[PDB]
Amino acid sequence: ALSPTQSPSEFIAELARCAQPIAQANDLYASVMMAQAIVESGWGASTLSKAPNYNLFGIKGSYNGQSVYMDTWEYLNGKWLVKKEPFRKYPSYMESFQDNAHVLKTTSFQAGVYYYAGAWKSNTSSYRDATAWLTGRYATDPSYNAKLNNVITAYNLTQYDT
């Protein structure tokens, strides 16, 4: 299953079935989507990513009012700190994929400016531009793009892009 899974190969094949169509429909890289699920969830092992939360993507805030508070590492002003933060809670694994796409496509702090626009496939030359854009935006980890890129390259995840 996504959890527990027999191998990275299993986990990847199961992610692709959801990620490929959603990424294609939304001008996103499937590879980046799948890397974010692997890195955020720890191959589907995190409590946040498992039932009854199903949040594969470390998405913060609330989903139709549904949230779970969890301890999380943040990198702030040059220090790693544990913070307790609100994460979205979903009814199944599918909504977390849809919501990752929604967050990337629609997040805006200023009129006419989409915060994640640099991770949209049409605004990039390669997936590396998208992972770089997420760093310091989606997550505070200053090595976030290196962690995503390392998963993409190790597992040839651009095979799922189109």
Author numbering: 4 to 165
What does the paper say about this structure?
One peptidoglycan (PG) hydrolase, AtlA, has a predominant role in E. faecalis septum cleavage. atlA mutants are viable but form extremely long chains and are greatly attenuated in the zebrafish virulence model of infection. AtlA is a multimodular N-acetylglucosaminidase belonging to the glycoside hydrolase GH73 family in the CAZy (Carbohydrate-Active enZYmes Database). The enzyme undergoes post-translational modifications (glycosylation and proteolytic cleavage) and preferentially binds to denuded glycan chains (preferentially found at the midcell) via the C-terminal LysM domain.
